[PDB]
Symmetry: D2
Subunit: 181 residues, 4 copies
């Protein structure tokens, strides 16, 4: 069982993803025309891989994929969000129109740090699209242009999100019964 | 946009088989811990996301990034690992999820590589199978669709990192 | 001896290199002879693989204060690396450099483009201090805008190999630095 | 001097280490002499970061035949690393070793599990040859099943630091190899 409640059903998620796709799509409409390049989705492994595969199919504009793998350092990652790069971008993003695809944004320390990092590669444009936004996503030195859902503070799992590498494969997002934590 | 010459399999055709072998895979794996899907970036991310939701038993994700050496990865297997597995797979029930198997040289090497980590079991599930999965020799337990010898794109598959985001698989016009 | 015919002329002898490194060791040592007390942490040598491995191993032994190693591996992106300096990271630092006194150890600074990007990358991790120590500096480093506190040798614009420096992964194991005969170029 | 009151005793001095490497180099050089002729490629030194970095820089300078460098970076998975030797690859070889004459350069061989795992891994890339040279060998390496062609010193089982070898990332920069005062652990 260990699912205490269903926060967001599969139907609700896929409905808003098609919604975000249209919005993102017309904002970057005319890209493949003016620049000749596609909208580039950058995703940090691995909580947002389910989201990015669905989102890209919802975007009515040519879309490329790019993945990063990162790892925490320890006692200061929780303070500055500086994170270890295990897998960098395969391609350069110079003069590219880049959209960071996130699963959740809470502290936003890491996202803030990633933004500054990707900025140093000098892209043509850069903003963030998150599926879920927690109450305290108001701090984080980073503006989010696209938000899927504004969710409560309690820990959620499903649809890419995990607890000890579990529950990622669920089509819905929900909360765990505290007996598992 | 006038570059796709042929559509091989529509989005509906794809989702059906995935739900099919997904139920098939789920029953075969119905150790005490979850089934582990391993994918090599980037071509099979759309397949592994859809597949995992189709497999009716608990399923975990793990990704590898690899790179070519050139005159030998052409010659045979052995690729450069850019990103290794996050966790050790000893005693795990592992399913290699690939997009397409052609020469199968890279697949042959990874299988031999992943075997050395002592998994409890190791099988392969590919969405597409080209002319010649006969030439190589890793037992592919699951095949979505066996396709002819022409270059395909779509549904995660690319040509110079394009056309990955398309919901269907098709053929390119030169 | 090792590579008959490919080395046109010797630029820096093994003894020349070692003497300068012993000098660099004392100078750096005096500049950081304070860290054990005040900060409590060791001088951290960050080196990008792999032209400067021979240099950093000799240098670390020539520095009379406690010294730690960190290695990075990077890769070129293409014409973008040669324009902005941005490189693909293949191997990052094992540990965060927050509040650490950091000394970048380089083999050669020419255009200095990748060094510039790297230093900006490392600074964003808020080290306590950050400086650069190169073995060789070439004339085009004048237009690089990276400040180098420690320079082993200023040399001409000719292409050199030896002491960690390569051409197609060769000549790194030479105890001395020299120039290549054009028979090797083409 | 460098670490005032941390080193209990000196096991191997700098001069002793350099003297031993010099013979190792010439020995390896004699065995790989007909390389620049027969195959026409250089002896390839492969080192896992980062305990053996000082050793390979000196060794490559002590070997009288052309040698190239290759570096790997690995991480521990956990208890499986300590049982099977299998490690996470953080940094792989830059070039393929197909048809290469490869010498794995190690700092210390104790259990030899990761070394054994590495050997089998590199063997699968079809090298022309593959051997192991380590600076130090401990008594428990006899239980290891990997063959070691070249050994600098056989030492006791005591934990040593210096010359690349560490304790919590310190003492790598020592030119000598010594034993730690338990007032450090
Ligand atoms: N699966 C799951 N993970 C969560 C949740 N909230 C925080 N996290 C994670 C905590 N560390 C990273 C990640 O949040 C991203 P960040 O804004 O940088 O703090 C959650 O509800 N579900
Ligand atoms: N997008 C797309 N790529 C293809 C196709 N056939 C081969 N490929 C690729 C060529 N290099 C690797 C990959 O498959 C060969 P393998 O090593 O056996 O896995 C194809 O129909 N479409
Ligand atoms: N072996 C050897 N390599 C060299 C030489 N000059 C430049 N290089 C290298 C060219 N790519 C990196 C390195 O230049 C450093 P930088 O231009 O500042 O980024 C040289 O004389 N010998
Ligand atoms: N600094 C230092 N490290 C040591 C020592 N003995 C073992 N080690 C290490 C323990 N983990 C890796 C290495 O052992 C090599 P192996 O057991 O063959 O795989 C030692 O005397 N000093
Ligand atoms: Mg995320
Ligand atoms: Mg997680
Ligand atoms: Mg594939
Ligand atoms: Mg492809
Ligand atoms: Mg350099
Ligand atoms: Mg070089
Ligand atoms: Mg070792
Ligand atoms: Mg250590």
């Amino acid at each position: 069982g260990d699912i205490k409640s269903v926060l967001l059903t599969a139907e609700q998620i896929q409905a808003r993803i098609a919604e975000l796709g249209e919005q993102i799509g017309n904002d970057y409409r005319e890209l493949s025309a003016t620049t000749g390049q596609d909208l580039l989705l950058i995703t940090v492994l691995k909580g947002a891989v389910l989201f990015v595969t669905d989102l890209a199919r919802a975007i009515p504009v040519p879309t490329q994929f790019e993945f990063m793998a990162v790892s925490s350092y320890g006692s200061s990652t929780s303070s500055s969000g500086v994170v270890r790069i295990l897998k960098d971008l395969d391609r350069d993003i110079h003069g590219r129109d880049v959209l960071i695809v996130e699963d959740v944004v809470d502290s936003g320390l890491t996202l803030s740090w990633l933004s500054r990092n990707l900025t140093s590669r000098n892209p043509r444009s850069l903003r963030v699209c998150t599926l879920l936004r927690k109450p305290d996503a108001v701090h984080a030195n980073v503006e989010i242009a696209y938000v899927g859902f504004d969710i409560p503070n309690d820990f959620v799992v499903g649809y890419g999100l995990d607890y000890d590498e579990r529950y990622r494969d669920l089509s819905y997002i929900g909360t765990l019964d505290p007996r598992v934590y």
